[PDB]
Amino acid sequence: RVKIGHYVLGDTLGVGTFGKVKIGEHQLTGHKVAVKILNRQKIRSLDVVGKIKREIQNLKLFRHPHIIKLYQVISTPTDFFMVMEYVSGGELFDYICKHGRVEEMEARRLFQQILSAVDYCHRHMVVHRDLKPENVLLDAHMNAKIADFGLSNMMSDNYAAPEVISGRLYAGPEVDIWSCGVILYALLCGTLPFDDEHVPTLFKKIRGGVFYIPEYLNRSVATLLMHMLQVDPLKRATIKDIREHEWFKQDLPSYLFP
């Protein structure tokens, strides 16, 4: 049984290809952390050590109320221990899959926190790492948190942008907006904007750029979504295009874009 300070490592929160994430618990106060364990032998084998090393150093600097905070890194000759903030409310996509669509006012609130987080990354993240929906979580207070814990791989019971699926070399921040578009749709509707049992038809839809907007959504939010999910990146919204929007400006806390 591995121990770090007063934190005793127990349950496995999520497993990725590079390593595992085990939840540790303070024995005295009951405070929880998330520890990403990265085996040296496994990551030398996958030849990704440098990339990870630099990702950690970058993350050390980060300071955002909606991105996962790295407290300290413990480096033993065999493993890397990344002690990070603990999240208790699981995935956002699982919450939507389980408890239906989100009330409009809450959909906006979560989306404001998410875009803020993506904006921080585009500003400070040196080499671009694409935003993935499975990396948007929820804390005890129902706030969105961006973390790489690999919960979607754990089992108990839209896919990619039009330029991504076309196989060309794409601009990351542009694909992130498209990715933020599907999340907003997921929030407001409870389903994914491009969805079909027949797979080749799914990609046709994504490349076609035509989707369904339910009658319960106003033109305002619909016209933001129609702008975020444009196939041609040259016409696709930027973060500031979203920030100047009628629907997005409403009840926006001024701290999210300082």
Swiss-Prot record:
Catalytic subunit of AMP-activated protein kinase (AMPK), an energy sensor protein kinase that plays a key role in regulating cellular energy metabolism. In response to reduction of intracellular ATP levels, AMPK activates energy-producing pathways and inhibits energy-consuming processes: inhibits protein, carbohydrate and lipid biosynthesis, as well as cell growth and proliferation. AMPK acts via direct phosphorylation of metabolic enzymes, and by longer-term effects via phosphorylation of transcription regulators. The active site is at D130. This is 5'-AMP-activated protein kinase catalytic subunit alpha-2. The AIS (autoinhibitory sequence) region shows some sequence similarity with the ubiquitin-associated domains and represses kinase activity. Ubiquitinated. ATP binds at L13, G14, V15, G16, T17, F18, G19, K20, V21, K36. It is found in: Cytoplasm; Nucleus. The chain holds residues 10 to 278 of 552 of the full protein.
